[PDB]
Enzyme design. Structure first.
Site, short mmCIF file in Angstrom:
data_model
loop_
_atom_site.label_atom_id
_atom_site.label_comp_id
_atom_site.label_asym_id
_atom_site.label_seq_id
_atom_site.Cartn_x
_atom_site.Cartn_y
_atom_site.Cartn_z
N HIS A 132 -43.79 -40.13 -13.97
CA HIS A 132 -44.94 -39.98 -13.42
C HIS A 132 -45.04 -39.58 -11.87
O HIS A 132 -44.26 -40.18 -11.15
CB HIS A 132 -46.00 -41.56 -13.99
CG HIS A 132 -47.01 -41.49 -12.94
ND1 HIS A 132 -48.24 -40.91 -13.03
CD2 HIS A 132 -47.25 -42.49 -11.79
CE1 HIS A 132 -49.01 -41.32 -12.18
NE2 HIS A 132 -48.42 -42.22 -11.51
N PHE A 133 -45.96 -38.96 -11.55
CA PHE A 133 -46.16 -38.39 -10.11
C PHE A 133 -47.40 -39.49 -9.61
O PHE A 133 -48.59 -39.14 -9.98
CB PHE A 133 -46.41 -36.96 -9.75
CG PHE A 133 -46.13 -36.68 -8.35
CD1 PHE A 133 -47.31 -36.64 -7.87
CD2 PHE A 133 -44.98 -36.20 -7.92
CE1 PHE A 133 -47.25 -36.31 -6.24
CE2 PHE A 133 -44.99 -35.87 -6.35
CZ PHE A 133 -46.21 -35.85 -5.78
N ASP A 134 -47.11 -40.47 -8.69
CA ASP A 134 -48.12 -41.16 -8.26
C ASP A 134 -49.11 -40.63 -6.90
O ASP A 134 -50.24 -40.66 -7.02
CB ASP A 134 -47.63 -42.51 -7.83
CG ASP A 134 -48.66 -43.48 -8.17
OD1 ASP A 134 -49.26 -43.45 -9.06
OD2 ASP A 134 -48.85 -44.54 -7.01
N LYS A 194 -56.32 -29.53 -16.04
CA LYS A 194 -56.07 -30.63 -15.49
C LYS A 194 -56.58 -30.44 -14.18
O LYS A 194 -56.30 -29.49 -13.19
CB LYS A 194 -54.47 -30.75 -15.39
CG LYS A 194 -53.87 -32.10 -15.01
CD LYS A 194 -52.31 -32.46 -14.91
CE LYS A 194 -52.09 -33.76 -14.37
NZ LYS A 194 -50.47 -33.73 -14.37
N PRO A 195 -57.26 -31.68 -13.67
CA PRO A 195 -57.80 -31.57 -12.40
C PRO A 195 -57.09 -31.46 -11.02
O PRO A 195 -57.29 -30.85 -10.17
CB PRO A 195 -58.73 -32.72 -12.27
CG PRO A 195 -58.75 -33.31 -13.87
CD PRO A 195 -57.41 -32.86 -14.40
N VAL A 196 -55.85 -32.32 -11.09
CA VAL A 196 -55.05 -32.23 -9.83
C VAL A 196 -53.59 -32.56 -10.26
O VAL A 196 -53.34 -32.97 -11.21
CB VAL A 196 -55.50 -33.72 -9.24
CG1 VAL A 196 -54.35 -33.65 -8.08
CG2 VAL A 196 -56.79 -33.82 -8.85
N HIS A 248 -44.14 -31.18 -12.91
CA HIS A 248 -44.14 -31.45 -11.27
C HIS A 248 -42.79 -30.67 -10.72
O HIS A 248 -42.86 -30.65 -9.37
CB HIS A 248 -44.18 -32.94 -11.10
CG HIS A 248 -45.40 -33.74 -11.47
ND1 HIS A 248 -46.38 -33.39 -11.13
CD2 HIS A 248 -45.49 -34.74 -12.58
CE1 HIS A 248 -47.26 -34.26 -11.85
NE2 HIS A 248 -46.85 -34.86 -12.52
N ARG A 274 -41.80 -30.83 -16.38
CA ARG A 274 -42.66 -29.42 -16.75
C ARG A 274 -43.98 -29.64 -15.79
O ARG A 274 -44.39 -28.46 -15.41
CB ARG A 274 -43.56 -29.64 -18.44
CG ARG A 274 -44.39 -28.43 -18.56
CD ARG A 274 -44.81 -28.62 -19.97
NE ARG A 274 -45.28 -29.86 -20.43
CZ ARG A 274 -46.78 -30.12 -20.03
NH1 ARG A 274 -47.58 -29.25 -19.76
NH2 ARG A 274 -46.91 -31.49 -20.85
N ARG A 284 -55.39 -28.35 -7.11
CA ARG A 284 -56.82 -28.97 -7.21
C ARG A 284 -57.56 -28.09 -7.72
O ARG A 284 -57.86 -27.01 -7.13
CB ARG A 284 -57.20 -29.76 -6.03
CG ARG A 284 -57.40 -31.17 -6.23
CD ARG A 284 -57.53 -31.88 -5.27
NE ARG A 284 -56.58 -33.05 -4.92
CZ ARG A 284 -56.78 -34.34 -5.27
NH1 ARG A 284 -58.02 -34.67 -5.62
NH2 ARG A 284 -55.69 -35.23 -5.08
N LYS A 339 -41.81 -34.09 -19.79
CA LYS A 339 -43.38 -33.82 -19.44
C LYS A 339 -43.37 -33.86 -17.56
O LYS A 339 -44.03 -33.23 -17.23
CB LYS A 339 -44.17 -34.94 -19.81
CG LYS A 339 -45.72 -34.82 -19.43
CD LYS A 339 -46.76 -35.64 -20.11
CE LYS A 339 -47.98 -35.34 -19.86
NZ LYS A 339 -48.80 -36.46 -20.08
#
Lengths: 124, 124
Positions: free
Chosen positions: A119-121, A41-43, A12, A10, A85, A7
């Protein structure tokens, strides 16, 4: 269902280009990476470095995640990235994105064996 | 209790310096802005522009917030900022922060009358 690692890839990873190719980059990428299917997806951030270089961040600077978790890592170097965004009149199912190119450090949360990004923080 | 606007100012505004003054900047600022009292706030960004310039972002580029809210705004220009993140052996009550200086666009959520920033969402 996707693995957390897949995920992340896909959502990032875009190693095919050194930077966003046009102002329409995010509109194109958010659609083709299936981030506009159920909602806009907002951002979302794309990273324009090799998968190896992004995975390598899991062995770099250990820092807190925004939520307080301790498995986040900041890249030692800056990386080419694109921030996408929602903007203007974006409304599902007619999603519309602003494309902002930058060179920044990335912060990712890492998990598993192999220890890879899930996860991209944030970017700095 | 603070107003949302005043909390934003306390957490995110540092117009007294053009950039972080040393590697100890975050350790000093997180303490003096009272962000290490009950816990170590894991992540926090300071903006080194005038309060007027940061408030002005609420009249700039309307974009989605990370959580999907529609009251976020991205600065048209880049701004001097400092990212502070817990690192190393940070453990309450012995908080320790990494200081990362950058020049990036800021994204803030705005509310109220006057319409002013109430949350720091991200930087690009």
């Amino acid at each position: 269902k996707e693995t957390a690692a897949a995920k992340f890839e896909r959502q990032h990873m875009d190693s095919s280009t050194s930077a966003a190719s046009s102002s329409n980059y995010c509109n194109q990428m958010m659609k083709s990476r299936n981030l506009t299917k159920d909602r806009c997806k907002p951002v979302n951030t794309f990273v324009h470095e090799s998968l190896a270089d992004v995975q390598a961040v899991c062995s770099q600077k250990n820092v807190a995640c925004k939520n307080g978790q301790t498995n986040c890592y900041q890249s030692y170097s800056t990386m080419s990235i694109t921030d996408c965004r929602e903007t203007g009149s974006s409304k599902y199912p007619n999603c519309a994105y602003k494309t902002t190119q930058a060179n920044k450090h990335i912060i990712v949360a890492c998990e598993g064996n192999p220890y890879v990004p899930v996860h991209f923080d944030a970017s700095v």
